Design an enzyme around this catalytic site. Structure first.
Site, PDB file in Angstrom:
ATOM      1  N   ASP A 158       0.930  -1.328   0.083  1.00  0.00           N
ATOM      2  CA  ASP A 158      -0.300  -0.080   0.050  1.00  0.00           C
ATOM      3  C   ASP A 158       0.352   1.541  -0.042  1.00  0.00           C
ATOM      4  O   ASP A 158       0.246   2.394   1.293  1.00  0.00           O
ATOM      5  CB  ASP A 158      -0.355  -0.237   1.436  1.00  0.00           C
ATOM      6  N   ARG A 162      -0.481   8.908   1.412  1.00  0.00           N
ATOM      7  CA  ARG A 162      -1.133   8.865   1.892  1.00  0.00           C
ATOM      8  C   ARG A 162      -0.187   8.144   3.376  1.00  0.00           C
ATOM      9  O   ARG A 162      -0.439   8.039   4.659  1.00  0.00           O
ATOM     10  CB  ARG A 162      -2.902   8.588   2.262  1.00  0.00           C
ATOM     11  N   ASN A 163       0.500   6.952   2.783  1.00  0.00           N
ATOM     12  CA  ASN A 163       1.362   6.238   3.725  1.00  0.00           C
ATOM     13  C   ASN A 163       3.200   6.425   3.511  1.00  0.00           C
ATOM     14  O   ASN A 163       3.344   5.368   3.941  1.00  0.00           O
ATOM     15  CB  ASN A 163       1.178   4.939   3.433  1.00  0.00           C
ATOM     16  N   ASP A 176       2.357   3.104   7.991  1.00  0.00           N
ATOM     17  CA  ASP A 176       1.219   2.356   7.154  1.00  0.00           C
ATOM     18  C   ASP A 176      -0.344   2.064   8.010  1.00  0.00           C
ATOM     19  O   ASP A 176       0.469   1.368   9.086  1.00  0.00           O
ATOM     20  CB  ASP A 176       1.350   0.938   6.559  1.00  0.00           C
TER      21      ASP A 176
HETATM   22  C1  LIG Z   1       9.417  -2.723   1.697  1.00  0.00           C
HETATM   23  C2  LIG Z   1       8.320  -2.359   2.998  1.00  0.00           C
HETATM   24  C3  LIG Z   1       7.560  -2.338   3.813  1.00  0.00           C
HETATM   25  C4  LIG Z   1       6.745  -1.924   5.264  1.00  0.00           C
HETATM   26  N1  LIG Z   1       7.007  -0.964   5.783  1.00  0.00           N
HETATM   27  C5  LIG Z   1       5.950  -0.548   6.932  1.00  0.00           C
HETATM   28  C6  LIG Z   1       5.530   1.227   7.160  1.00  0.00           C
HETATM   29  C7  LIG Z   1       4.810   0.983   8.568  1.00  0.00           C
HETATM   30  C8  LIG Z   1       4.121   0.229   8.969  1.00  0.00           C
HETATM   31  N2  LIG Z   1       3.057   0.710   9.944  1.00  0.00           N
HETATM   32  C9  LIG Z   1       3.323   1.534  10.224  1.00  0.00           C
HETATM   33  O1  LIG Z   1       4.286   2.591  10.172  1.00  0.00           O
HETATM   34  C10 LIG Z   1       2.144   1.738  12.026  1.00  0.00           C
HETATM   35  C11 LIG Z   1       1.792   3.603  11.821  1.00  0.00           C
HETATM   36  N3  LIG Z   1       1.608   3.843  10.527  1.00  0.00           N
HETATM   37  C12 LIG Z   1       1.095   4.944  10.725  1.00  0.00           C
HETATM   38  C13 LIG Z   1       0.863   5.869  12.139  1.00  0.00           C
HETATM   39  O2  LIG Z   1       0.769   7.220  11.718  1.00  0.00           O
HETATM   40  C14 LIG Z   1       1.686   8.864  12.408  1.00  0.00           C
HETATM   41  C15 LIG Z   1       3.017   8.160  12.741  1.00  0.00           C
HETATM   42  C16 LIG Z   1       3.464   8.617  13.396  1.00  0.00           C
HETATM   43  N4  LIG Z   1       3.524  10.388  13.282  1.00  0.00           N
HETATM   44  C17 LIG Z   1       2.029  10.932  12.869  1.00  0.00           C
HETATM   45  C18 LIG Z   1       1.153  11.525  12.844  1.00  0.00           C
HETATM   46  C19 LIG Z   1       0.319  12.311  12.213  1.00  0.00           C
HETATM   47  O3  LIG Z   1      -0.887  13.215  11.831  1.00  0.00           O
HETATM   48  C20 LIG Z   1       0.289  14.510  12.899  1.00  0.00           C
HETATM   49  C21 LIG Z   1      -0.505  11.232  11.815  1.00  0.00           C
HETATM   50  C22 LIG Z   1      -0.453   9.887  12.215  1.00  0.00           C
HETATM   51  C23 LIG Z   1       1.186   9.656  12.311  1.00  0.00           C
HETATM   52  C24 LIG Z   1       1.298   5.204  12.847  1.00  0.00           C
HETATM   53  C25 LIG Z   1       2.067   3.609  13.029  1.00  0.00           C
HETATM   54  O4  LIG Z   1       1.960   3.410  13.879  1.00  0.00           O
HETATM   55  C26 LIG Z   1       1.704   3.184  15.507  1.00  0.00           C
HETATM   56  C27 LIG Z   1       3.965  -1.385   8.324  1.00  0.00           C
HETATM   57  C28 LIG Z   1       5.282  -1.319   6.946  1.00  0.00           C
HETATM   58  C29 LIG Z   1       4.919  -2.888   6.540  1.00  0.00           C
HETATM   59  C30 LIG Z   1       3.471  -3.356   5.915  1.00  0.00           C
HETATM   60  C31 LIG Z   1       4.983  -3.859   7.442  1.00  0.00           C
HETATM   61  O5  LIG Z   1       5.716  -2.939   5.525  1.00  0.00           O
END
Ligand SMILES: CC#CC1=Nc2ccc(NC(=O)Cc3ncc(Oc4ccnc5cc(OC)ccc45)cc3OC)cc2C(C)(C)O1
Length: 298
Positions: A158, A162-163, A176
């Site tokens: 994904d 947005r990610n 993510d």
């Molecule tokens: C090749 C490859 C690859 C690969 N890469 C990844 C990278 C990241 C993830 N998961 C996460 O980051 C989880 C996560 N995501 C967003 C989150 O939202 C935020 C955080 C920090 N600051 C934020 C400020 C904000 O508004 C100001 C608003 C939101 C925020 C939190 C949060 O965890 C708590 C998962 C993967 C997977 C899919 C496993 O694979």
């Protein structure tokens, strides 16, 4: 695996705050963690947890994500895992470093008016505007993050603006939202079979064969580049996302160049959009390419 001695953070040392992103079963919340990193120091963090409606299956999915983030490790361009609350009698919580500016798509769109290709004017010297250097830098940083993640044998599934999150000193981080986005309410997710998929970011071998690879992430990366150099616009503008869209894409129909791109950046998009996944560039190749673009830009 899960090493509690390293990652377990006491729930009481975490002070929950305002919502950052809300889904149907998951959510991301801002919080204040005491001594999560440097001894006896307050730190703003983002917490991923489940909400009313969530089931044991979402709880399982959230534990898998935590274990995947543990396995990944630290990189400047991947959101950094700080800890977790996994103990019984409380909800599962995944804690990461807070990224002040939020998602890159909303950020670019909000700053679209404050965009100047090059800061050449002497009067403009002390103004915080978005430049082609900034856009190339974000593109290059996402590629460094994706190259690191590729070396960890991970596949995103994904990748999109947005990610991507924006932190301080123009540092971008791959994330993510997953369950912390309501995909059934969200327009970037289209109904295909029994699920809501991000169709406009998906490679043709993913839309029809449900094949997710590091090279299908490269395709999504090309779409993310379009998002960056369109300053947060939605892909395939004016196009109905249906069977005719899917058919044309497999034949070789591509997006037109975004309004803020450089010929080479749209060429880089087109390369990422090559029909054959083996013919698309690697993340290691995109790092060197985008790295050279940034050095020529100065
Ligand atoms: C090749 C490859 C690859 C690969 N890469 C990844 C990278 C990241 C993830 N998961 C996460 O980051 C989880 C996560 N995501 C967003 C989150 O939202 C935020 C955080 C920090 N600051 C934020 C400020 C904000 O508004 C100001 C608003 C939101 C925020 C939190 C949060 O965890 C708590 C998962 C993967 C997977 C899919 C496993 O694979």
């Amino acid at each position: 695996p899960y090493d509690a001695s390293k990652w377990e953070f006491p729930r009481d040392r975490l002070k929950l705050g305002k919502p950052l992103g809300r889904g149907a079963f998951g959510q991301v919340i801002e919080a204040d963690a005491f001594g999560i990193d440097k001894t006896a120091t307050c730190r703003t963090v983002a917490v991923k947890m489940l909400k009313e409606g969530a089931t044991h299956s979402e709880h399982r999915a959230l534990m898998s994500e935590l274990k995947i983030l543990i396995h990944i490790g630290h990189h400047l361009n991947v959101v950094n895992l700080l800890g977790a609350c996994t103990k019984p009698g409380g909800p599962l919580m995944v804690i990461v470093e807070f990224c002040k500016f939020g998602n890159l798509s909303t950020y670019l769109r909000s700053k679209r008016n404050e965009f100047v290709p090059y800061k050449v004017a002497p009067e403009d010297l002390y103004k915080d505007f978005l430049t082609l250097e900034h856009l190339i830098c974000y593109s290059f940083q996402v590629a460094k993050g994706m190259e690191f993640l590729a070396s960890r044998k991970c596949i995103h599934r994904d990748l999109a603006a947005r990610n991507i999150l924006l932190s301080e000193k123009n540092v971008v981080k791959i994330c993510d939202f997953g369950l912390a986005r309501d995909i059934y309410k969200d327009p970037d997710y289209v109904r295909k079979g029994d699920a809501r998929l991000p169709l406009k970011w998906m490679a043709p071998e993913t839309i029809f064969d449900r094949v997710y690879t590091i090279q299908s992430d490269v395709w999504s990366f090309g779409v993310l580049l379009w998002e960056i150099f369109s300053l947060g616009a939605s892909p395939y503008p004016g196009v109905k996302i249906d069977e005719e869209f899917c058919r044309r894409l497999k034949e070789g129909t591509r997006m037109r160049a975004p309004d803020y791109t450089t010929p080479e950046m749209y060429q880089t998009m087109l390369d990422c959009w090559h029909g054959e996944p083996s013919q698309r560039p690697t993340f290691s190749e995109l790092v060197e390419h985008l790295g050279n673009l940034l050095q020529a830009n100065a």
